C-alpha cells in the first residue's frame, strides 16, 4: 500500500493486482464474488508467487544494511501513467504447466497429471491479461484443463473399484470416453473402454468404441489390435451387460457422482471451472479444483486489465 503499490490498486482492482499490491483480503473477496472462490488453502502458493514475483532486492551499500526493495512493472517507460501495473507471469507458463500435464498423461500418471492441470487452473484464476485474444484463450485453456481433470478423475475412480462392481466399472470406462480431451489423448480413453466392453462379452460397445478409435489411428501396434477386436466383436451384436450409456445422446458427466446429466436432468454448474453436477451437489466444493462453491452465483472470472 505504498507509493508504487497505490498506483497499482488505483489502476486495476483485478485479483492478480490486488494480490501483488499486498492486499490479500480485497482479493479474497473479489475471487469470491467473481468466481465463487470459497476454500483458500490450495491457493496460498499462488498468492505468494504473484507477490514475490514482482519484487526484487538490490544490495545496500554498507552490506550489513538490509537490501532495497525494487518493483517489477508490467510495461516500460513508454506507457500511460494510468497503465502502471505489476508484472504477473502470464500464459507462457500456463501452457508450460498444461504440457507437464500431457507429458504425465502419456506416461500414465493421472495423480501427477491432475496435479498439473489443477495448477494451471489456479494460475489462470489469478492471471493478468491485456489483449482480448489472450482472455479468450485463457478460458479455452481453463475449459480443457477441467476436461482432463474430469476425465482422469473418472479413470481414477474406475481403478478404485473392487471386483464385483463390474456393472459400474463398465459404466465409468465408457464415460471417460465422453471427456472432451484432444483426439490424440482420447485414444487411451477409447482403448480402455473398447477393451473392457470386449472382456465382458459386451461387443455392442466394444465394437462402437474400437471403431470410434480406429477413426483417429490408421495403423500402428495398438491401432492394429483395435481392428482385430472390432471384427470379432462386430460378428455378434452382443449385449452382455447393458449400461447407462447412450453414444447417440447428449449428456454431460456429473463431476461428482459420474452419472450422466441428460438435457432434462436438473443440474448446477461451477462458477470457476464450469464443470456440471446433479442438484444433489449444490453448495459443496467442485471436484475439478477444490476452490469454488457449486451453484453460488458469480459475476465472471476477471482476468483482463
Amino acid at each position: 500500500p505504498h507509493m508504487e503499490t497505490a498506483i497499482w490498486i488505483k489502476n486495476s482492482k483485478l485479483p492478480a493486482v490486488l494480490v501483488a499490491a499486498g492486499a490479500f483480503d480485497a482479493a479474497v473477496q473479489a475471487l469470491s464474488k467473481q468466481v465463487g472462490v470459497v476454500k483458500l488453502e490450495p491457493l496460498k502458493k499462488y498468492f505468494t508467487n504473484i507477490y514475490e514475483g514482482c519484487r526484487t532486492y538490490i544490495p545496500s551499500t554498507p552490506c550489513e544494511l538490509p537490501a532495497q526493495l525494487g518493483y517489477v512493472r508490467a510495461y516500460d517507460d513508454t506507457v500511460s501513467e494510468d497503465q502502471i501495473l505489476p508484472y504477473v507471469p502470464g500464459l507462457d507458463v500456463v501452457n508450460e504447466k498444461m504440457n507437464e500435464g500431457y507429458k504425465n498423461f502419456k506416461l500414465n500418471k493421472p495423480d501427477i497429471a491432475i496435479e498439473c492441470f489443477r495448477e494451471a487452473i489456479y494460475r489462470i484464476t489469478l492471471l493478468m491479461v491485456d489483449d482480448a485474444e489472450d482472455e479468450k484463450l485463457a478460458h479455452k485453456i481453463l475449459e480443457t484443463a477441467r476436461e482432463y481433470i474430469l476425465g482422469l478423475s473418472i479413470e481414477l475412480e474406475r481403478r478404485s473399484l473392487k471386483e464385483g462392481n463390474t456393472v459400474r466399472m463398465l459404466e465409468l470406462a465408457a464415460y471417460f470416453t465422453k471427456a472432451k480431451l484432444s483426439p490424440i489423448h482420447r485414444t487411451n480413453a477409447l482403448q480402455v473402454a473398447m477393451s473392457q466392453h470386449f472382456k465382458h462379452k459386451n461387443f455392442l460397445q466394444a465394437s462402437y468404441f474400437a471403431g470410434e478409435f480406429l477413426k483417429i489411428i490408421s495403423s500402428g501396434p495398438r491401432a492394429e489390435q483395435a481392428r482385430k477386436i472390432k471384427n470379432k466383436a462386430d460378428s455378434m451384436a452382443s449385449d452382455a451387460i447393458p449400461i447407462d450409456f447412450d453414444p447417440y445422446a447428449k449428456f454431460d458427466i456429473c463431476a461428482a457422482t459420474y452419472k450422466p446429466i441428460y438435457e432434462d436432468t436438473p443440474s448446477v454448474s461451477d462458477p470457476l471451472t464450469g464443470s456440471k453436477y446433479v442438484i444433489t451437489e449444490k453448495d459443496k466444493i467442485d471436484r475439478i479444483a477444490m476452490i469454488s462453491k457449486i451453484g453460488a452465483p458469480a459475476s465472471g472470472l476477471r482476468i483482463r486489465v
Binding site: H2, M3, E4, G22, F24, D25, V28, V38, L40, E41, K44, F47, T48, N49, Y51, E52, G53, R55, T56, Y57, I58, P59, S60, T61, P62, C63, E64, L65, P66, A67, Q68, L69, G70, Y71, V72, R73, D76, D77, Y87, P89, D92, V93, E96, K97, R123
Partner: protein
Amino acid sequence: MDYFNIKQNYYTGNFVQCLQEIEKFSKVTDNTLLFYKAKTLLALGQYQSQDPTSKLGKVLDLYVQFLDTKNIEELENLLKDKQNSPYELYLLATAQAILGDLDKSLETCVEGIDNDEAEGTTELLLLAIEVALLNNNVSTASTIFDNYTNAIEDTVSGDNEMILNLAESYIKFATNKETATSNFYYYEELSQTFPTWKTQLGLLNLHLQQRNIAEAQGIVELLLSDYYSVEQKENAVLYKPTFLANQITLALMQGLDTEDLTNQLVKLDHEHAFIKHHQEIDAKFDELVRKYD
C-alpha cells in the same frame, strides 16, 4: 581530494583493490583513510582494531562489536550529547537502521548532514537516502537528495561525484524511472569496469526490473561460473543472501518450482528483506484461512 581511487573501488565492491589504494599511504592518521580502511577490512572479513586512541577509530571498534550482538548500548552511549563528526554518526545511523529504528536513523543522518565537518558529509547523504528508501520514504529520499544537490558546488562533486551517482541510482531504482536508459547504462558501465558481485548483482536487478529474464538468466549462470563463486569466494559469500533472493524472483518469472528449494538456502541462512517479507506475507494468508471457517 586524492583518494578518489580508494573510494571508486569501495562503492563498486572490490575491497580486494580498495585496500591496496589505502596501502599507498603510510598511515596518515587521516579520518577518511581510517574510515575506508576499517570499513574495507570488515568487508574482506579481516577487520582488526585500527587503534583505540581515535574517538572515531574507537566508534568503529564499538560499531564492529555492535554488529556481533545487535546491541547499541555503548555505541549510542559513547556519542550522546557529544558533538561528533558525520563519520562517527554514519556508523551510528547504520547501527540504528540495522536494528530496525529506520526513523531514528534518518534523523541521525540528517543531524550530521547539516553540521560542521566538511568531511564525511557526502558519505552521509548516501546513507540518508538509503535509510529513507528502506523506510519506504521515496520523496523524502528525493528531497534530502534534491536539497543537497542543487546547493553544493563543483568541488564536492569532484571526489564524491561517484558517492552521489550511487544514491541517485537507488532513488532511480525505487522510483522505477529511467530504469531502461540512464539507470541501465549506469549499472551497465559499472559492471564492465568493475566486475564485482556488487556491480554484477546490480545489473542483474536492472534486468529483472526490465523483464529481460533472458539476459537476467545469463548474469546468473555467470555468477555461478567459477570466476565468481570460487576465484572470488571472498566478497561473494558476502552477497549470497541477496543473490538467492534475486534468483527466487527470477525463477518466479519463469514459473519455476525452485521457488522453494532456493529460498531454503536464504531462509536457513539469513533473515533479510526477502525473508522478512516472505514470512509477513505467508502469515497474512494463514490469517485469512483461519478467518473463513
